[PDB]
C-alpha cells in the first residue's frame, strides 16, 4: 500500500476556470490588441515625402474603443451582439489614433483621430459581454452558456480555425528519392522566407538556393565567408577518421579549380549568381543577409554563419552512412497558429499600404499647390481599412503578396446545430497539407501526441486525420523575449563561440547551446545547466513557459521560447513522492490556495512535447518508480469534448468511438437559452429533452445537463418479427403518439429592399380583393393589409409570402412575389422589420414545422450504433414482462458481436440500477463504477441481479423460453429525415447551355447516370434500354445535314452549296451537335457521310 490522495480531481476545474478550452482563443486576441498593435505602430512610425524634407507625420499612440455604431448623423450608441445579429450588421469598434502632422511651417497635433474600425470578439476585453451576471445576460438577450470566440460579420458567426505548420529557424535532414539531404527554412519577423538545402551526390556536397543559378561547392562558400586556410575548415567540420574520407574529395575538387583567396571565391559566386554594383559586392551582400537571415551579422562577420554551416555539414555527415533520419510527423516540432498573428499580418499590411499610398496622395499636390498650407486630415480616408478587414473575415481569402502567401478556407460559419457542435468547432484544428490520398504518416496516429489531441475525435470519410481536435487539458504558449534568458545563461558560465576554434566542438564532452535555432555557445556538464535552469523556472524569476531539452546523440541542448507550443500542467514528485499532499488541497477546497500560487509554490509545472521526451511520467500513484519525475494529474483528460459523451469509452472499440464522436455533433436538440429570439437559417429543436442517467464528469465540466440533446427510453434487446435487420430498429406506436421524439424545424426567410442612385424605388402593394365578395385572393391569402404575412398563420404550397414590386429599369413595375416552395404545410412564428446600415428595409420571417418520427428516420444509440426505423408496432404487441412495461425501442442482438460494443450493456445496467435506486451513476473513462457493487444493489429491490427478466409474449400469449434484456438507454434523434431525402421528377426545367436536367433538388432536377452504371448495362448486353434512357429520355434532337458536303444546315437548306437538292436529316443528341458546332470553330470540321439504314 502507498499513500494515495483522492483529491486531485478538483485541480482540473480550477485550472479550466483560469484558461483552457476556449479561453485561449480570447487570450490570443486580448494579447494582440494590447501588445502587437502598438509594436506595429512603432514599426511604421515615421513617414515623410521627398518633394522637400519639411513635411512629416509622427505616430505617438494608438488604441481602440468599445463596440459602437455610426448612425444617421453623429449617433454613436453602445450596441449589443444580438442587435448586430438581427440587423445583419457587423460587430466592430473604431480605432482612434493620436498622430501629429506638420502643415505649412507649424506642427499640428490632432488628438483622437479616427482611421478605421476593427472587429471585436464576443467575449473579449473590449466587449460589453464580460464580467456580467446571468440576470444581466438575460437583459441583453444572450445565452450565458455561449462560449463565444467567433466573429460577427454581416449577421453571421464566423470562427477562424487553428492551423498547424512546421517549425521555422531549424535544420531538417530527410532522405529523398536517391539519398539524404539537409534543409533549412528561415523566416523571422521581417518578411524574408528562405529555403536553403545541402545535397550529396558523387561524394560531393552542393548548396541549392533559388537565388543562385546552379550548385556552389561548400568549400567555395566557406572561403567566401572568410575562413581561408583549408585546415581550420576541416577543423570546424570535424576531426575524425571517417569524416575525412568523405570530406577529402570536395577539398580536392576545390583545389582543382583555381580559387585560393576571398576575392577569387567572391568573383566565382558573383559569376554564378543571376539576378533580374559589381559582382564582388553582389556576392558579399548575398552571403550577408539573403541565405540565412535568422543569424544576424554585427559588422560583416560570417563566423557564426560558418560554424552554423559546419555543424549542419557534420549533422549531414553523421546522417550519411546510417539510417538516422528526421521525420515531419513529430509534433514537438509542429507549431500551431491561432487567429491572432493572422490578424496581425493583415493589419500591418493594411497599415503599410495606407501609409505608403497616402505618401503618394500628398506627393502630387506639393508642387501643384494653390495655397501655402496643406491639410492632410481632409486628404484622409476611412473605407479601405474596414473594407479589407470585412473582406478578409467573410470572404476567407488571406492573400498577402507583401508576405508572399495565399491561403483559402481559413474562416468558417459557426455550427449552430446543437450545443456540442458549437463548442466542438472551437477546438477544431486544420492541417497545412491538402486533402489528398498520398498522405499516410501525418494521417496516422503518432505516438508523440499524448494528452494534446484527441485520438478518437476525427471525422470518418475523406479527411481521416487531417482534421484534429484539442484535448481537455492543454495550453498554447504565446511569444516572449530572450533577454533575461540569455543573460542568465551567460552568467551560468556558457562560453562564447567566437573564442574557441573548430577543434573543440568535436570533443564529446563539449555541448552546444541552441535557442530558437541559434547557437549561443559551448557549455560543459550540461546536467548542472539543465538543473539550475529548471530550478530558476520553478522559482518564479523566469516565466514558466520556457522549454529546455538535451539530446545526447548529437550532444546539443535546446532552449525553446517561441510562441505556439503545447503546454499541460503536471504534478511534480521528489524522489519517491508527490509534493501535493492532503493539506495543500484542503485549502483549495476551502477557497484559497488556487492554481497560480500552486505554480508559485513549486508544486506543479508545465512540460512540452520535447521536454517530456527526457522525463518519466507516472500514470497512477501506485506505479511511481525511483526515476519518475512528473505525475499526470488524471488519465481521463486524454479524451476530447466529443468523446466525453460516450459511456465507458475503454469498453467500446475505437471505430465505434469515432462514429459516436462524429455523430454527437449532428444530433439535434436544444441550442441555448435564447432560441426564440435568434433567427438562424435552419434550426432543429426537440420537444421534451431528458437527462442522461449514466453521466460523465466531462458532462458536468461542460454543464451538458442543462442542454441535453437526447431522451431516455426503455430498450429490449431481442429480435422481433422482421424489422430489426442489420441496423433497423422498431418503435412503439403508443409511445410515438404520447410524444416520444417530437421534433421542430425552424426556417428563415429574409428579404432586403433598398433604393437606387436615381429616384426609383420599391413598393409592396399587398393583398388582392375580387369583385364578387371582399376576400383576399387565393394567391395573396396570408398577406396582411400592409403587404406582408402576419404571424400565427399557416402557409401552404406555392403561396405568396411578401409582394415585391420593383421597376423594370410613371415607370413600369415588375412584381416579384416571394413564393414559398415546400412539400409540407408550414406555419408562421414571427415577423421582424428593421433597417440595415445602408438604409434599406429588411423583413425576416421564421417558419415553424412540427414533425413526428416515422419509417425512414435515423436514430443513434450514443454508442456508435446508427439505424433507420423499421416497423411501427402498436401497443397490443411489444410484450410486457411482469409489471406491464412495454419495450419502447426494440434492439437487435445481432449487431453486438461484430461491432464489439460492451459499454452498451454496462450503461443499460447502470441506468436501470440508477432509475431504481434514484441516483445518477458515474461512467467516466478509466474508472467510474464497476459491475460488482451495482449488481448486488439490484438484488435489494427484488429484480434479477445482472440483466434478465421473465417476459410474456403478446401476439401469442405464451411466455418466452429465453430471457430478454430490458433497460433504460439514452437515445438521440439525428438529422437527414426521409421527408427531405425524397425526390422525384418527370418533366421540369432544363439548362440553356445544354438541354439536360439541372443539378440539385432546390431547382427540381433529375439523377445522373455515370459510366460505372453504364458498364453494368454493357456487361448484360442490353442495347434498347441503354439507348432509351440516354438519348430518348434525356435529349432527342432532329438535325439536318447535306450529302455533298457534310455540314450543319438549317430549314433543309445549305449555305455552303446554296442548294437544297442534297439535303437529309437524322436523329442526334443535342450534346453531340453542340460538340460539333464547338469543334467547327476550332478548325475541326466533322465532314459527315450519310447513308440509308436499308443500305
Amino acid at each position: 500500500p502507498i499513500p494515495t490522495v483522492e483529491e486531485k480531481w478538483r485541480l482540473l476545474p480550477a485550472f479550466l476556470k483560469v484558461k483552457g478550452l476556449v479561453k485561449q482563443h480570447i487570450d490570443s486576441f486580448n494579447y494582440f490588441i494590447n501588445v502587437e498593435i502598438k509594436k506595429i505602430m512603432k514599426a511604421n512610425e515615421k513617414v515623410t515625402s521627398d518633394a522637400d524634407p519639411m513635411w512629416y507625420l509622427k505616430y505617438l499612440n494608438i488604441y481602440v474603443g468599445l463596440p459602437d455604431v455610426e448612425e444617421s448623423f453623429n449617433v454613436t450608441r453602445p450596441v449589443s451582439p444580438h442587435e448586430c445579429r438581427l440587423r445583419d450588421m457587423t460587430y466592430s469598434a473604431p480605432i482612434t489614433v493620436d498622430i501629429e502632422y506638420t502643415r505649412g511651417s507649424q506642427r499640428i497635433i490632432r488628438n483622437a483621430l479616427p482611421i478605421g474600425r476593427m472587429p471585436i470578439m464576443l467575449r473579449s476585453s473590449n466587449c460589453v459581454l464580460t464580467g456580467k451576471t446571468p440576470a444581466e445576460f438575460a437583459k441583453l438577450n444572450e445565452c450565458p452558456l455561449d462560449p463565444g470566440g467567433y466573429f460577427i460579420v454581416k449577421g453571421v458567426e464566423k470562427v477562424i480555425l487553428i492551423q498547424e505548420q512546421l517549425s521555422k529557424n531549424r535544420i531538417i535532414v530527410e532522405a529523398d528519392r536517391k539519398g539524404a539531404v539537409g534543409a533549412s527554412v528561415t523566416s523571422s519577423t521581417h518578411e524574408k522566407k528562405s529555403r536553403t538545402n545541402m545535397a550529396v551526390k558523387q561524394g560531393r556536397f552542393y548548396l541549392r538556393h533559388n537565388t543562385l543559378s546552379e550548385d556552389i561547392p561548400i568549400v567555395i562558400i566557406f572561403k567566401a565567408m572568410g575562413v581561408e586556410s583549408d585546415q581550420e575548415i576541416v577543423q570546424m567540420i570535424g576531426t575524425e577518421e571517417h569524416v575525412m574520407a568523405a570530406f577529402g574529395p570536395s577539398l580536392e575538387e576545390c583545389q582543382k579549380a583555381q580559387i585560393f583567396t576571398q576575392m577569387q571565391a567572391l568573383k566565382y559566386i558573383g559569376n554564378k549568381v543571376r539576378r533580374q554594383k559589381t559582382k564582388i559586392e553582389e556576392a558579399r551582400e548575398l552571403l550577408a543577409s539573403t541565405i540565412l537571415t535568422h543569424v544576424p551579422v554585427k559588422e560583416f562577420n560570417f563566423r557564426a554563419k560558418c560554424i552554423y554551416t559546419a555543424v549542419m555539414v557534420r549533422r549531414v555527415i553523421l546522417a550519411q552512412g546510417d539510417n538516422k533520419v528526421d521525420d515531419r510527423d513529430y509534433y514537438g516540432n509542429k507549431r500551431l497558429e491561432l487567429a491572432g498573428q493572422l490578424l496581425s499580418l493583415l493589419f500591418e499590411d493594411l497599415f503599410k499600404k495606407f501609409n505608403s499610398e497616402m505618401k503618394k496622395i500628398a506627393d502630387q499636390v506639393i508642387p501643384k499647390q494653390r495655397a501655402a498650407q496643406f491639410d492632410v486630415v481632409k486628404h484622409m480616408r476611412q473605407d479601405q481599412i474596414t473594407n479589407g478587414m470585412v473582406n478578409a473575415i467573410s470572404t476567407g481569402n488571406w492573400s498577402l503578396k507583401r508576405f508572399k502567401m495565399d491561403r483559402q478556407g481559413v474562416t468558417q460559419v459557426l455550427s449552430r446545430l446543437s450545443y456540442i457542435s458549437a463548442l466542438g468547432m472551437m477546438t477544431r484544428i486544420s492541417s497545412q497539407f491538402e486533402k489528398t490520398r498520398k498522405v499516410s504518416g501525418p494521417r496516422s496516429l503518432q505516438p508523440s501526441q499524448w494528452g494534446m489531441l484527441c485520438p478518437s475525435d476525427t471525422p470518418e470519410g475523406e479527411a481521416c486525420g487531417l482534421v484534429k481536435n484539442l484535448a481537455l487539458m492543454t495550453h498554447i504558449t504565446t511569444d516572449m523575449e530572450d533577454g533575461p534568458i540569455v543573460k542568465l545563461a551567460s552568467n551560468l558560465g556558457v562560453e562564447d563561440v567566437n573564442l574557441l576554434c573548430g577543434e573543440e566542438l568535436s570533443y564529446p564532452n563539449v555541448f552546444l547551446v541552441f535557442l530558437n535555432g541559434n547557437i549561443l555557445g559551448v557549455i560543459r556538464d550540461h546536467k548542472k545547466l539543465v538543473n539550475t535552469f529548471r530550478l530558476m523556472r520553478r522559482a518564479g524569476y523566469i516565466n514558466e513557459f520556457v522549454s529546455i531539452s538535451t539530446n545526447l546523440t548529437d550532444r546539443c541542448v535546446y532552449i525553446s521560447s517561441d510562441g505556439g507550443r503545447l503546454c499541460r500542467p503536471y504534478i511534480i514528485v521528489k524522489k519517491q513522492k508527490p509534493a501535493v499532499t492532503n493539506k495543500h488541497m484542503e485549502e483549495l477546497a476551502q477557497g484559497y490556495r488556487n492554481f497560480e500560487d500552486f505554480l508559485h509554490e513549486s508544486l506543479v509545472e508545465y512540460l512540452d512535447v520535447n521536454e517530456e521526451n527526457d522525463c518519466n511520467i507516472a500514470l497512477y500513484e501506485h506505479t511511481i518508480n525511483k526515476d519518475t519525475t512528473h505525475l499526470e494529474i488524471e488519465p481521463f483528460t486524454l479524451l476530447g469534448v466529443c468523446a466525453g459523451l460516450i459511456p465507458y469509452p475503454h469498453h467500446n472499440q475505437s471505430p465505434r468511438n469515432t462514429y459516436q464522436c462524429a455523430m454527437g455533433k449532428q444530433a439535434m436538440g436544444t441550442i441555448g437559452y435564447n432560441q426564440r429570439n435568434r433567427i438562424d437559417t435552419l434550426m432543429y429543436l426537440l420537444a421534451y429533452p431528458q437527462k442522461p442517467m449514466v453521466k460523465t464528469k466531462t458532462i458536468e465540466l461542460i454543464e451538458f445537463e442543462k442542454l441535453p440533446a437526447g431522451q431516455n427510453a426503455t430498450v429490449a434487446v431481442m429480435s422481433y418479427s422482421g424489422y430489426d435487420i442489420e441496423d433497423a430498429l422498431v418503435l412503439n406506436k403508443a409511445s410515438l403518439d404520447r410524444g416520444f421524439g417530437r421534433c421542430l424545424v425552424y426556417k428563415n426567410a429574409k428579404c432586403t429592399l433598398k433604393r437606387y442612385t436615381n429616384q426609383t424605388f420599391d413598393k409592396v402593394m399587398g393583398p388582392m380583393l375580387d369583385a364578387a365578395t371582399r376576400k383576399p385572393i387565393w394567391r395573396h391569402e396570408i398577406l396582411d393589409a400592409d403587404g406582408i404575412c402576419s404571424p400565427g398563420e399557416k402557409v401552404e404550397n406555392k403561396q405568396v409570402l411578401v409582394n415585391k414590386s420593383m421597376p423594370t429599369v410613371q415607370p413600369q413595375y415588375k412584381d416579384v412575389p416571394i413564393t414559398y416552395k415546400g412539400a409540407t404545410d408550414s406555419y408562421i412564428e414571427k415577423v421582424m422589420i428593421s433597417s440595415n446600415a445602408e438604409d434599406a428595409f429588411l423583413i425576416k420571417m421564421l417558419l415553424r414545422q412540427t414533425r413526428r418520427p416515422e419509417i425512414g428516420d435515423k436514430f443513434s444509440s450514443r454508442h456508435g450504433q446508427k439505424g433507420v426505423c423499421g416497423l411501427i408496432v402498436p401497443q397490443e404487441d411489444m410484450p410486457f414482462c411482469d409489471s406491464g412495461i412495454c419495450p419502447d425501442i426494440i434492439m437487435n442482438p445481432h449487431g453486438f458481436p461484430s461491432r464489439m460494443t460492451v459499454g452498451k450493456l454496462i450503461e443499460l445496467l447502470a441506468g436501470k440500477a440508477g432509475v431504481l435506486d434514484g441516483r445518477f451513476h458515474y461512467g467516466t473513462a478509466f474508472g467510474g463504477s464497476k459491475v460488482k457493487d451495482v449488481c448486488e444493489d439490484l438484488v435489494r429491490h427484488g429484480y434479477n441481479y445482472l440483466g434478465k427478466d421473465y417476459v410474456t409474449s403478446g401476439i401469442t400469449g405464451e411466455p418466452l423460453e429465453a430471457y430478454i434484456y430490458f433497460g433504460p438507454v439514452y437515445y438521440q434523434k439525428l438529422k437527414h429525415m426521409v421527408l427531405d431525402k425524397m425526390h422525384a421528377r418527370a418533366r421540369g426545367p432544363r439548362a440553356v447551355l445544354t438541354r439536360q436536367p439541372t443539378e440539385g433538388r432546390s431547382r427540381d432536377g433529375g439523377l445522373r447516370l455515370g459510366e460505372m452504371e453504364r458498364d453494368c448495362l454493357i456487361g448484360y448486353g442490353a442495347s434498347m434500354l441503354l439507348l432509351e434512357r440516354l438519348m430518348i429520355s434525356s435529349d432527342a434532337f432532329e438535325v439536318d445535314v447535306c450529302g455533298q458536303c457534310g455540314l450543319l444546315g438549317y430549314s433543309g437548306w445549305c449555305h455552303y452549296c446554296k442548294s437544297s437538292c442534297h439535303v437529309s436529316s437524322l436523329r442526334i443528341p443535342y450534346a453531340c451537335k453542340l460538340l460539333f458546332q464547338e469543334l467547327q470553330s476550332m478548325n475541326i470540321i466533322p465532314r459527315l457521310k450519310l447513308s440509308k439504314y436499308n443500305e
Binding site: A138, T670, Y673, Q690, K691, M693, P708, R738, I885, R919
Partner: protein, 67 residues
C-alpha cells in the same frame, strides 16, 4: 421543456406531480424518498420526473414583458 402530462411507455399521468416533487425535494428528502412517497413504484414512469430539465423557466426571462 415542460414535464410530460403522460408517460411515454405505459401512459400514466406523470404531469400532476412535478410541482409536488419540487416542493418535496426541499423538505430534507432524498430523491428516492420523494419518488417512492409520491406514488411511483416502477421505473418506466419514474425517470419522467427524476431525469427532467426545466428550460421554460430560463425561457421566460427572455419572454416579452409589458411596461
Amino acid at each position: 421543456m415542460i414535464i410530460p402530462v403522460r408517460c411515454f411507455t405505459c401512459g400514466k399521468i406523470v404531469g400532476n406531480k412535478w410541482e409536488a416533487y419540487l416542493g418535496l425535494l426541499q423538505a430534507e428528502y432524498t430523491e428516492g424518498d420523494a419518488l417512492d412517497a409520491l406514488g411511483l413504484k416502477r421505473y418506466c414512469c419514474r425517470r419522467m420526473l427524476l431525469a427532467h430539465v426545466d428550460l421554460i423557466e430560463k425561457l421566460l426571462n427572455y419572454a416579452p414583458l409589458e411596461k
